[PDB]
Design a protein around this ligand. Structure first.
Ligand SMILES: [Ca+2]
Ligand code: NA
Length: 1070
């Protein structure tokens, strides 16, 4: 049926790919489903893993298609286009496709929709097989060296081949690698597995022998009576079918959706339109689609006047992009109820004029129609309606008319300006924020190329011995074929070259003549280049006769790179690097031992050293293997080496001399008597002022009463500009408008400002900040436009000397914002329709031991909305548990951020499959309950959990090496139920590690507000702990016995095959 259709998508459809890259023109390609692996591939140029697909959207609504909405280059059609949104992160990737006919689109939509659901729900062995298929096709047949490299890429350290052999090899390895696990229980019969389910797992259904039979067959899929091989039993222990999570809880229980809305935790998003940070990230319709599909129910719109009478949405007074209110409203309409039938609240932060408010209200009614909530559910009620009563409804939260009528918001100027790096002298962007008192700025925001050409090795018998060594070393160690070769400059015949190749265990040298152009071996053909000559003899033999084969790679290319030092001690490296005022300064130095190097680098004002060993044709950094030092360093110029630090500044003598234009002073190194009338006369140590710097050997400056006269530049030393140095991060406002992004603070009244008319350093619009009381202190700042330069200067200079539309108010039925009045709580004055909102800092004043009970009482009748403080420009999140435990319902989090709070959010709303409403337990909505008084629980049964971490499979990599994994186990809830514990780490294994015996015990007094959290970290070579994977569960949904913990990434998306196996017992039993 649909199966026949899916087989047809294997053939190949030609469709136009609208690339996400704003430069790549739309190209046409042949798209095929690969059912073997459950992928989509196109001409192979690209690949989508179907398990990563989140939405298959008929039509032309994507950024890729939007690039051509006006442009006639291409005309996306509603009818001939669809979008595949897929990925592991909040920001999904998109594959936007235009087909030649409506029937093709419908085919792909229909087929992929089914492959999406089938791939996600597939039995684990099928997932494993598809994983192996994908691994194999990554490398018919493969070599064993390929195999060692392939296993290293999947986090396994290995201390002809066909796929079948590979499959069996993987199978044996996973089982043998974890034999040692304490499993008190070559074939397992349907009766043995049945007893296991009943005796260890507490699976009561299993007493029905036939269900056990069907259970095993649902897992195997491949029949007489079912059984498991031992390796298959262990595979099952790790599988999702054996998950610690009771999937029953995934379904909504209508009976728990009948309390008033104030009794529910409600999945809530802060500034939903944003995809990244609060200052410059892109606003996107996709963020609304993403949040609503994650189960979010309360989303936020920041409305500002748009250009044509309709509001746009962006973060006011920042560089975040704008999107149209109309487009947002249609996105909401399309996605609000895909994941849940339950009501959506629109929190409107309205900055619009009355006229554009009026258009909003009109558009709300036109677009949403009956979906919009315009009347109260029950004018006689004494409390908010239930989620069940508001199904399929959208509520407007907006400030409402009475009848008949220090962050970047409180900021003078915000923007991106460029500062000049004092080490590499490039311009980099930084966030700048001017307040009424200060500037805050943030942290940064032909043959030569060939492998066989080794250049000049030596100048006598030197070069020949070196060439022989390199070639012998290579051939023996790698078992290289005869004809493996390299080329060098001839030591004997100037201008000529010498070829060395392997033959019968021995090296052969052949002179390559160079003449003018003609290159030729003796008595052989002539060629126009040395490249052509070698390219020729790699295809046909030279005269024995030997065809050239494998090029010997250069292992010593580092010797000429600027960061390499062949002779340099540890202390000498530290002295050089402590002179560089930026982290990321680095160098490589050879050590006294053979085959030993050290990377020395500056991080956090301190120098650190890590060793690198040469091992054959490769280098080792920890367990991370690279082809050479040059490749190692190149990798860590593009990927962090230490914490978040990349290798940035190669440090040698020249770099240190250049570490370094407004009223600059220089010190004279020697006397100079003016040789000409326009030249300056001075003595050694004279300070020359107002210097005008210029290449050519001559600068201009003032001294001895003479103004702007010339002098040799090599006669002076530049006085340091203290502004290049790093501000003292020790003492440095922790809650500036930039939050943790802060780098520097300027006391504006103590500064002067001036525009440089000439610009500077290939920037046109530049001003200089100075401080009259700190000579030589100056900061050159570039802006992107003269207009921005002008606005910045006058605002800085000035600091240094110093109605609601009824049509819209009508739509606010519930969620009516009023000022919080503590004294109305619990009185007849409290109104169930009125609500208040709390920045996270004000909220902490009510969710503490003193006021928390009073806040619970408030929240039983009325909604409160919590949102992050303004200083979280990075879009970090606050801990939501202290708010939830005082009954707060709308605890708004930045959904784009993969931090722990959002992992707790998606964990909490697992109860009900992310419908977005979780009924608060009865014990909390009781008069006695107090989140900071364990005694308020009365006679609630507590919970004791005993856990042992036995092993893991398919742990994700973190960079190039092999993870050394350890697992942290946390219970999260009230303060009195919260604690953490952790295993030891395992050495060099993420694919199938097992852990020592370490029984953990957790005790939970309030199991109704409690989460069990597993975080897998690595212990890296610097002894830092780096996140690898994660799984957080509500305690109520936990099963017992030997259970799998399926792992997720930091965005709470499922990782392929990654899981722990634990022994988990819960008391009292139930
Ligand atoms: Ca807002
Ligand atoms: Na167009």
């Amino acid at each position: 049926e649909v199966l026949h259709l899916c087989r047809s998508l294997e053939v190949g459809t030609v469709m136009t790919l609208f690339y996400s890259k704003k430069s790549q023109r739309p190209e046409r390609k042949t798209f095929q489903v690969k059912l073997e692996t459950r992928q989509i591939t196109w001409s192979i140029e690209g690949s989508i893993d179907i398990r990563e697909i989140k939405e298959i959207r008929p039509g032309k609504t994507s950024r890729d298609f939007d690039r051509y909405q006006e442009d006639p280059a291409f005309r996306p059609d509603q009818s001939h286009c669809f979008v595949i949104l897929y990925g592991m992160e909040f920001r999904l990737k998109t594959l936007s496709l235009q087909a030649t006919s409506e029937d093709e689109v419908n085919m792909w939509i229909k087929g992929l929709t089914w492959l999406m659901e089938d791939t996600l729900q597939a039995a684990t062995p099928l997932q494993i097989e598809r994983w192996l298929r994908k691994q194999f096709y990554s490398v018919d047949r493969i070599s064993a060296k390929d195999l060692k490299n392939m296993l290293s890429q999947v986090n396994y350290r290995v201390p002809d081949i066909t796929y079948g052999q590979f499959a069996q090899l993987y199978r044996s390895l996973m089982y043998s690698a974890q034999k040692t696990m304490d499993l008190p229980f070559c074939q397992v019969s349907l009766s043995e597995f049945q007893q296991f389910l009943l005796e260890y797992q507490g699976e009561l259904w299993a007493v029905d022998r036939l269900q056990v039979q069907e259970f095993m067959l649902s897992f195997l899929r491949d029949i007489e009576e079912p059984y498991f091989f031992l390796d298959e039993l262990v595979t099952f222990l790790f599988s999702k079918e054996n998950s610690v999570w009771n999937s029953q809880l995934d379904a909504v229980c209508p009976e728990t959706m009948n309390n008033p809305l104030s009794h529910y935790w409600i999945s809530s998003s802060h500034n939903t339109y944003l995809t990244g940070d609060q200052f410059s990230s892109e606003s996107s319709l996709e963020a609304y689609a993403r949040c609503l599909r994650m189960g979010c129910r309360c989303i936020e719109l920041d409305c500002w006047d748009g250009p044509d009478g309709m509001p746009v949405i962006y973060h006011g007074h920042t560089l975040t992009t704008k999107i149209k209110f109309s487009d947002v409203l249609h996105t909401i309409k399309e996605h609000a109820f895909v994941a849940s039938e339950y009501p959506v609240i629109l929190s409107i932060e309205d900055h619009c004029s009355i006229a554009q408010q009026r258009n909003m209200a009109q558009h709300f009614r036109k677009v949403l129609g009956d979906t919009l909530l315009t009347k109260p559910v029950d004018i006689a009620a004494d409390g908010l309606p239930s989620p069940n009563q508001l199904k399929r409804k959208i509520l407007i939260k907006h400030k409402k008319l009475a009848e008949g009528s220090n962050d970047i918001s409180n900021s003078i100027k915000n923007g991106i300006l460029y500062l000049e790096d004092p080490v590499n002298h490039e311009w980099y962007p930084h966030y700048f924020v001017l307040t009424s008192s200060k500037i805050y700025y943030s942290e940064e925001t032909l043959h030569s190329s060939e492998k066989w050409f080794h250049g000049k090795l030596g100048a006598g018998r030197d070069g020949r011995h070196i060439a022989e060594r390199l070639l012998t070393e290579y051939c023996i160690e790698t078992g290289a074929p005869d004809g493996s070769f390299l080329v060098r400059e001839s030591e004997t015949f100037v201008g000529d070259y010498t070829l060395s190749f392997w033959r019968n265990g021995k090296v052969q040298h052949c002179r390559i003549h160079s003449r003018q152009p003609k290159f030729f071996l003796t008595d052989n053909l002539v060629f126009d280049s040395l490249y052509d000559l070698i390219t020729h003899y790699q295809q046909v033999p030279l005269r024995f006769e030997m065809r050239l084969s494998e090029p010997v790679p250069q292992t010593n290319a580092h010797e000429s790179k600027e960061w390499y030092h062949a002779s340099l001690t540890r202390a000498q490296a530290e002295h050089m690097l402590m002179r560089v005022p930026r982290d990321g300064a680095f160098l490589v130095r050879k050590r006294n031992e053979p085959n030993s190097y050290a990377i020395s680098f500056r991080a956090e004002g301190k120098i650190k050293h890590c060793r690198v060993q040469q091992e054959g044709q490769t280098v080792m950094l920890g367990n991370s293997e690279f082809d050479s030092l040059v490749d190692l360093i190149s990798y860590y110029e593009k990927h962090p080496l230490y914490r978040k630090m990349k290798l940035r500044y190669p440090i040698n003598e020249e770099a240190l001399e250049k570490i370094g234009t407004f009223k600059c002073a220089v010190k004279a190194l020697f006397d100079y008597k003016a040789q000409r009338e326009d030249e300056l006369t001075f003595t050694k140590s004279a300070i020359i002022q107002n210097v005008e710097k210029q290449d050519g050997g001559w600068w201009r400056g003032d001294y001895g009463g003479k103004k702007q006269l010339w002098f040799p530049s090599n006669y002076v030393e530049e006085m340091i500009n203290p502004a290049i140095l790093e501000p003292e991060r020790e003492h440095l406002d922790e809650n500036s408008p930039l939050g943790d992004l802060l780098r520097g603070v300027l006391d504006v009244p103590a500064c002067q400002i001036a525009i440089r008319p000439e610009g500077k350093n290939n920037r046109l619009f530049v001003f200089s900040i100075s401080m009259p009381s700190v000579a030589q202190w100056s900061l050159d700042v570039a802006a992107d436009s003269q207009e921005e330069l002008q606005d910045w200067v006058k605002k800085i200079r000035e600091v240094a000397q110093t109605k609601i539309a009824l049509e819209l108010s009508e739509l606010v039925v519930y969620c009516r914002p009023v000022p919080f009045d503590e004294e109305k709580i619990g009185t007849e004055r409290a109104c169930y329709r009125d609500m208040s909102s709390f920045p996270e800092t004000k909220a902490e004043k009510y969710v503490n031991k003193a006021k928390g009970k009073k806040f619970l009482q408030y929240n039983r009748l009325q909604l409160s909305r919590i949102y992050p403080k303004g200083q979280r420009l990075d879009s970090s999140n606050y801990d939501p548990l202290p708010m939830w435990i005082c009954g707060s319902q709308l605890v708004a989090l930045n959904f784009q951020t993969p931090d722990k709070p959002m992992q707790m959010n998606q964990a909490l709303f697992m109860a009900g499959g992310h419908c977005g409403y979780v009924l608060q337990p009865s014990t909390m909505r009781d008069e006695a309950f107090d989140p900071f008084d364990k005694s308020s629980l009365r006679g609630l049964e507590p919970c004791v959990i005993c856990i042992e971490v036995l092993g893991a499979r398919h742990l994700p990599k973190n960079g190039r090496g092999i993870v050394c994994p350890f697992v942290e186990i946390e219970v999260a809830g009230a303060e009195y139920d919260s604690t953490k514990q952790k295993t030891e780490f395992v050495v060099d294994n993420g694919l199938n590690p097992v852990w020592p015996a370490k029984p953990f015990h957790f005790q939970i007094s309030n199991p109704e507000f409690a989460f069990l959290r597993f975080v897998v970290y690595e212990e890296d070579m610097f002894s830092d702990q780096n996140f690898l994977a994660q799984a957080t569960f509500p305690v109520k949904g936990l099963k017992t016995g030997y259970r799998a913990v399926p792992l997720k990434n930091n965005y709470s998306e499922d990782l392929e095959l990654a899981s722990l196996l634990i022994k988990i017992d819960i008391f009292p039993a139930k």
